[PDB]
């Protein structure tokens, strides 16, 4: 028994296994793909599900870290979450059609709320004022960096365009005299 550069490969593999369990069992939505902290909205939404809405609001404030972070004693989850997902899947052509009908009702509700809009008007002009601040300053930087280089060669373009209108006027009086 003589290990050499094996316990260092085993400690790295044990660290690579522990990092795979912590990244996977951290959060389901945060690890996959893509909010402001608001305790006043959790207090106003208490009056909904009325028990699970307060459980999901505290789970959103804990995973994001007027904001206080309290309990990361929530997510050793990875074996209890596998049994909960397999138990919930067992309780769950006809199901595929009822989901497509509800998705068309939600798409018709999303097209109705957008049609009625086109308080909220003051936020869109302020987003435009942020856009008119950002893009037009980026435009004036891209225009003046271009106009230091293009207006020199616009004069190389336009004055040679003026040579064509005199070469054409001398061509017609010469072809007339020919």
């Amino acid at each position: 028994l003589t290990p050499k550069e094996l316990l260092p490969h085993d400690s790295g593999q044990e660290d690579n296994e522990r990092s795979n369990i912590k990244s996977g069992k951290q959060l389901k939505s945060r690890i996959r793909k893509f909010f402001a902290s608001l305790p006043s909205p959790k207090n106003d939404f208490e009056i909904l599900s009325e028990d699970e809405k307060e459980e999901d609001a505290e789970i959103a404030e804990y995973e994001k870290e007027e904001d206080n972070f309290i309990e990361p004693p929530s997510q050793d989850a990875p074996r209890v979450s596998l049994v909960a997902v397999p138990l919930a899947y067992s309780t769950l052509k006809n199901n595929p059609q009822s989901a497509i009908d509800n998705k068309y009702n939600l798409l018709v509700a999303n097209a109705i709320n957008k049609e009625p809009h086109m308080e909220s008007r003051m936020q869109h002009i302020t987003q435009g004022r942020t856009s008119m601040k950002i893009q037009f300053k980026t435009a004036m930087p891209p225009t003046e960096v271009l106009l230091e280089s293009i207006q020199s060669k616009v004069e190389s373009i336009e004055q040679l365009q003026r040579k064509l209108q005199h070469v054409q006027p001398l061509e017609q009086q010469n072809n007339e005299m020919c």
Partner: protein
């Protein structure tokens, strides 16, 4: 009748062979020059794969009004494009709020089954 990229009535339509879809020659070429793929089924397709496949002229009305008509239609299309983008970002945002509460509820089910397991031990004693 409709190209399934822009929805225009195609004036030089081309059909893809990897997926059954009649596209427009100009729009499908710009997609293939970006990435060598089919926009619907994401299958590997090239420009030589395309097979180049009703024309009714609009007669609008009985010229300065046609200038402001074009001005209105580009004004409407810019808003009919903008409203369909903010709708996409908010339905993805409201899908994200459902994904947190789906994973938070299956953690609340873990403590509720523990209260049922603790109760089943007490009922047996």
């Amino acid at each position: 009748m409709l190209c399934a990229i822009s929805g225009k009535v195609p004036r030089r339509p081309v059909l893809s062979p990897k997926s059954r879809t009649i596209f427009e020659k100009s729009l499908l070429e710009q997609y293939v020059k970006d990435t060598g793929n089919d926009p619907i089924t994401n299958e590997p397709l090239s420009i030589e794969e395309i097979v180049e496949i009703a024309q009714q002229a609009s007669l609008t009305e009985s010229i300065p009004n046609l200038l402001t008509s074009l001005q209105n239609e580009w004004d409407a299309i810019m808003l009919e494009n903008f409203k369909l983008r903010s709708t996409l970002d908010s339905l993805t945002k409201k899908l994200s709020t459902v994904m947190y509460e789906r994973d938070a509820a299956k953690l609340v089910a873990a403590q509720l089954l523990m209260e049922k397991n603790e109760d089943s031990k007490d009922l047996p004693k």
